[PDB]
Point group: C3
Chain length 491, copies 3
């Protein structure tokens, strides 16, 4: 009953989490959170974005109107999902700049198509083929009009179509490439055709291509597809002496957040802002490792599969030398605070959380948590990131852009966690130290630091006296004479 | 009279500034500075860069020699400013890869055109048109030479021009597409023409397509513009059996800092390194929010409109627990230093700045200031970042590259300020602590820490005595017996 | 003889190294390491990567089989090295999209060529030219087959080659453009030729353009080179009635780590993972200034020539105020630890290293060293980064992408060293201070801090006594009464 002991301590937990810092790759903290999303449900949620499942229709085939894609007439989407099993079932074609036309239609988000009354005099219209069957019958792309001779004549076609609305019109037409010279003249009479499609500030000028090619659905002929945008006040002109595969009208163009993704993931009823080819994913985390291909408000793709952000002090079951230092050891039995006090006196032993120091640590970690978890990444139509054919220069640059980006983000994420972690350990160490010092300063000359986080208080200090220390109102003058006597034999 | 008090503390100002740190979204420091440039005069300064106002001439029209653009002949520039009201008033034309021709001329910085002694045998030269009037007369592009039949013949043209110089020559030439067959033969006799322009390492062939395009300034025909760069030692050769629109010469090519910008900002007499479409901007700050399109030594575009870097300590009207810690509270009355001393003694009271500690904090903050505002970014011709027409793949990539870059820089800026600010707060705290500990150490056993940043000095300590503490020459043996006697009653 | 002195200290060296920190552009530490590789031996190491010296053969000429390039038949490479002096010595040619064909072959990493069973009925094979000699004899590209008439006939050629294998095939073929009409018909009999090469998914039809181009090795004609990829299950057709320069077979395509590099550096025996055009470089450092063009596991290209990373404490021949603070000064004579103890007692003076605290500093710096120098960047085929022609849009973008990337990495490198440096100095200061405090704490009331890193120990303290302090077993109760008596004159 002549002295007391008061020791400062901090909590610890039986199972901690290993995190990475600036100086240690493996240091144990009381608690952490995962910043990389690395899993998916495997399914694409159908809200909030308007998902159109292309099923066995590539957007291009929907656009041209391959008979097996008629259900997609006038459809709209925020995201068109294109499946890899999808195939073409009409006249064989190619699209110079396929990727661009697929991109610009993807991006526009609609197949809304308006028929117009092109006046095609002196040709047979509605040319059809065995390669584009409707049931047992010859057929063709719904949105195009294959013209051939009437009788023995294919005249110079020369028609116009003014755009008098105040949206942009997308026209999609083509040129037919016959197999032989015989075929060119049987169909179009002239030996060399040409197709000139123009506006007031643009043109396209195409000569047909001749030769035997491999049969696709019975045919060696082909069509190359071309497109033209006609602005308000402008006009489409089409001029041709053979081989024209005429548009029937225009597609409406829109701007907005629409896009296209290659995925075989099923569509499901649920809500997710972020879509990948592997399925929708949560965007509570700032990073993800699921896929570099995303649509919507998503974590940023990084190469790491896990990045643990520390949310607690170091676990002992820093710059200041208190935690894992002169305080030998955490207290697992302190479960209502991060920091506090154990005492021993005449009336027995006890333990109290310190609230102010506990809150200061938690506040500061919440602050870096709020900065870090506060999501800022919403992207829609972007670039292609996987490729089905080898191409060279353009594809090289596309991959290299993305590869560059991913390494830069991966690095920022790696650094950020290592920094934030070092700093969390150290600021938690600091708060412990600051409490100890605050206590030392209250004791003035009535106590000595025992070297282990505890002070020997050189006077009778009951539970009320000890509380006075914990709440910061200890009055050292009251006890000085007594203490100095025990401490130094003064009087 | 028989003891003194010496208190430490630090300055404070009535109204400080709110900054962001690693741990707080909002925390007040004495002084801060803005790192985002977000305003502009609206006007483009005419030095130190050579600014050429294109007015109503697109560079393309200046290049080709639209008669309304004659004043631009042989012009030079560091930056050609292109206006939106600019329009074309010559023969209607298209330029496949318009943007490459525009880019490489913009980058070359010059329209210096050298006229060469081309021989066109058997053809009529200087064809003209109602679409490209020169006063009351029909006219044409100054830089091109429209060739037509002579009498009843248009010969196979085969003409060459060696490059015997040590610089690259840019040849701009064209191909004429007539309206009808009648026109093709009236002009060129041949039913189908053709141009082939070749060097030892390159060849281009264009076949014109006859036909009607929309009436522009009275004309249905068109001209398409192509280009060839001939290296030193190489030879230009031109081959044509009709439809050639010949070069009269070439443009000198330069490399350097030149570029082109779209803007309607007026030009003004002033000095700015950095130009944006919105006007020139100062470049003392390291970031800006005005426009992603810049020319010259510019702050880097970031998404944030403001980012305040702290240039002073925390304002109290840290890891170390001194400032806003055991020192309750700053001193508004301390105006000649950041840190100092106040005392109560025998001869009255007083205050003095500590210079060493004030300087060390200031120096450290100036150090990071120099790092951060040190102008390092000078960029000239880049990629276009705004587009008037939809194009697909290539535009997608250009937008993605810029948007990637901006996000990465906005991040760097965000983190930097957050880091710098946490560390400034903490280093200013440390300096206060270091000074207090310095003082405690000098006092030895002659004073006691009162716990609030002050020492009770247990001896008569007059102004000279106090000064000896502030200048670090206090001799504790002189006072020790006196002090130990008042603390401990030794005598 | 009734007291002793015990000072704590740290090492120093006469000449240290200057580094950059957050707050000082120049401050001296004991030791540092360079993080930018700036030297090369100048030679390209021939392990571990398979390096193929193109010598005087551009890869394109090895691919087509220029007679001077027969030694490259069926060759493979991880890196094909292309020399400046390399030249073409065969029929002069051009390759639309040359760079993609060169890219995709470079990336495939092989010239393995499989001859196939094309049946050329009615025509003569193996056309040769004086412009492509094999010694004294006229010759031709080995991989191509120049077809011409047989007797008085050249028929319409129509062949197929199915792909029944499970890999992709690369077909490289050409079209000959004669200099005159005479030549056209002597060779091919038709006045105009045509080559149509097709698959189910693609068609290319080239019309030769007759006429003179500049004489190259005695020839005014040219051949144009095209390529077609045939996937498994698909079918190559070739259809032509003149001017076809046919393939003899195909090149095997592969995916993997191959590329091509332009360099005049000699190849030689050594081992380096990272290749630049200047020669190989070590990859122990995380950045390099040698060249933005690299192959293999390389340090990342940055703009700075040097970045010195501190591996040691501040050198004195911090946040905490010990090093270059209350310890005036380091000890050059302390060679077997970073921190330690000097004393003076009755038995004389001495000195001893502190191992725990030395290790803790070292360990933590080793840890950030391992984070930093951990080689994590391995790249192979990328984008071209230097260009020999002006091109416009695409090249602008390519340059912009690499320039963007470099400035971001150079920023990360600058920040990293400034951060880690500030932090190293601070953590080394901290460890000093922690040792001081540890020592203070053991001494309890038996010593006083002299203000300069030393303690006055107020009792007889022999060498064994001193060692008890250094090893942490000093028992203060043995000495307390004696010490209080000399400090005060009391207990
Ligand atoms: C007349 C006939 O039945 N001939 C038999 C041949 O079949 C025809 O062969 C030609 C090619 O020589 C075409 O492939 C014909 O197919 C169509 C098709 O695509 O389905 C028929 C269409 O009506 C026709 N459409 C139009 C608008 O012209 C179309 C086009 O002409 C071509 O696609 C243009 O490329 O072709 C096919 O019916 C068979 O080739 C011959 C061989 O021995 O046997 C004949 O009995
Ligand atoms: C004066 C007039 O308007 N006459 C009537 C016809 O207009 C003519 O129509 C022809 C088309 O066949 C051309 O447009 C003529 O204009 C020019 C031009 O561009 O201005 C005249 C130039 O001399 C000529 N220049 C050259 C070097 O040939 C030029 C070119 O041929 C074309 O630009 C090539 O495409 O054409 C124009 O004068 C009117 O169309 C007709 C029927 O109503 O009656 C004419 O008498
Ligand atoms: C000054 O600092 C440099 C950089 O830290 C020190 O050199 C480094 O020293 C370590 C230990 O000697 C080297 O690591 C060792 O390498 C081998 C394997 O390569 C292994 O046997 C060890 O376990 C260890 O990891 C390190 O590679 C080396 N770094 C460099 C660039 O040389 C140097 O020791 C310091 N000098 C002084 C006087 O402290
Ligand atoms: C371990 O750390 C996580 C991350 O801070 C804590 O989870 C948060 O808890 C708070 C308080 O209830 C919530 O408001 C957050 O939204 C939760 N965030 C996350 C990411 O899960 C968790 O509280 C911590 N565990 C302990 C014992 O403190
Ligand atoms: C050119 O060659 C192709 C390939 O042999 C020929 O097409 C084949 O002809 C038969 C009969 O019409 C078809 O059953 C085959 O499927 C065809 N093969 C392919 C790959 O399409 C074509 O007939 C030839 N052309 C000429 C004019 O002789
Ligand atoms: C092709 O059609 C166009 C458009 O109808 C014709 O051009 C028009 O011609 C009339 C009479 O010359 C003009 O008054 C109109 O301004 C023209 N319209 C446009 C948009 O140019 C053109 O003459 C026709 N071409 C042929 C060969 O008959
Ligand atoms: C087109 O003109 C060129 C150059 O005048 C002719 O090519 C030259 O022909 C002579 C032989 O007649 C060579 O010795 C020269 O070296 C050639 N010069 C070049 C630059 O190639 C070419 O013959 C002409 N073509 C025709 C059909 O007249
Ligand atoms: C996402 O998809 C690709 C293949 O399409 C796969 O390589 C990757 O591992 C997938 N990730 C997950 C988490 O399923
Ligand atoms: C605040 O900061 C800037 C940058 O250091 C400085 O130039 C300015 O004078 C400072 N203001 C005050 C009141 O110190
Ligand atoms: C600069 O211009 C852009 C587009 O013209 C505009 O949206 C932006 O608000 C402008 N900013 C300033 C600061 O003038
Ligand atoms: C590497 O080569 C480049 C250009 O080829 C040159 O400018 C650079 O200085 C070279 N580096 C070294 C270390 O020689």
């Amino acid at each position: 009953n002549n002295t007391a002991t008061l020791c400062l301590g901090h909590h610890a937990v039986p199972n901690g989490t290993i995190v990475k810092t600036i100086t240690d790759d493996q240091i144990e903290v009381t608690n952490a959170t995962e910043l990389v999303q690395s899993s998916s449900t495997g399914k694409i949620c159908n809200n909030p974005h308007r998902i159109l499942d292309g099923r066995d229709c590539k957007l291009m085939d929907a656009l041209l109107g391959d008979p097996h894609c008629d259900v997609f007439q006038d459809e709209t989407w925020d995201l068109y999902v294109e499946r890899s099993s999808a195939s073409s079932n009409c006249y064989p074609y190619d699209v110079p700049d396929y990727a661009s036309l697929r991109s610009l239609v993807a991006s526009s988000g609609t197949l809304e198509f308006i028929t117009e009354g092109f006046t095609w005099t002196g040709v047979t219209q509605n040319g059809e083929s065995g390669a584009c069957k409707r049931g047992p019958a010859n057929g063709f792309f719904s949105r195009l009009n294959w013209l051939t001779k009437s009788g023995s004549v294919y005249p110079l076609l020369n028609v116009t179509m003014p755009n008098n609305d105040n949206f942009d019109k997308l026209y999609v037409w083509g040129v037919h490439h016959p197999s032989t010279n015989q075929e060119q003249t049987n169909l179009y009479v002239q030996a060399s055709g040409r197709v000139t499609v123009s506006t007031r500030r643009s043109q396209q000028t195409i000569i047909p291509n001749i030769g035997s090619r491999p049969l696709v659905r019975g045919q060696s002929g082909r069509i190359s597809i071309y497109w033209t945008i006609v602005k308000p006040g402008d006009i489409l002109m089409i001029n041709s002496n053979g081989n024209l595969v005429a548009p029937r009208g225009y597609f409406k163009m829109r701007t907005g957040k629409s896009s296209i993704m290659r995925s075989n993931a099923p569509i499901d009823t649920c809500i997710s802002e972020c879509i990948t080819p592997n399925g929708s994913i949560p965007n509570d985390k700032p990073f993800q490792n699921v896929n570099k291909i995303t649509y919507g408000a998503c974590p940023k793709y990084v190469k790491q599969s896990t990045l643990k952000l520390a949310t607690g002090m170091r676990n002992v079951p820093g710059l200041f030398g208190a935690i894992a230092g002169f305080i030998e050891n955490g207290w697992e039995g302190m479960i209502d605070g991060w920091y506090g006090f154990r005492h021993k006196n005449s009336e027995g032993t006890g333990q109290a959380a310190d609230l102010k120091s506990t809150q200061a640590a938690i506040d500061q970690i919440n602050g870096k948590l709020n900065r870090v978890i506060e999501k800022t990444n919403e992207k829609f139509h972007q670039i292609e990131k996987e490729f089905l054919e080898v191409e060279g220069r353009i594809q090289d640059l596309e991959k290299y852009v993305e590869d560059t980006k991913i390494d830069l983000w991966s690095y920022n994420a790696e650094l950020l966690v290592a920094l934030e972690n070092q700093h969390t350990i150290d600021l938690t160490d600091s708060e412990m130290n600051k409490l100890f010092e605050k206590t030392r300063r209250q004791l003035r000359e009535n106590a000595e630091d025992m070297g282990n986080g505890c002070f020997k208080i050189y006077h009778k200090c009951d539970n009320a006296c000890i509380e006075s220390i914990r709440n910061g109102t200890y009055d050292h003058d009251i006890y000085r004479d007594e203490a100095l006597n025990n401490r130094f034999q003064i009087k």
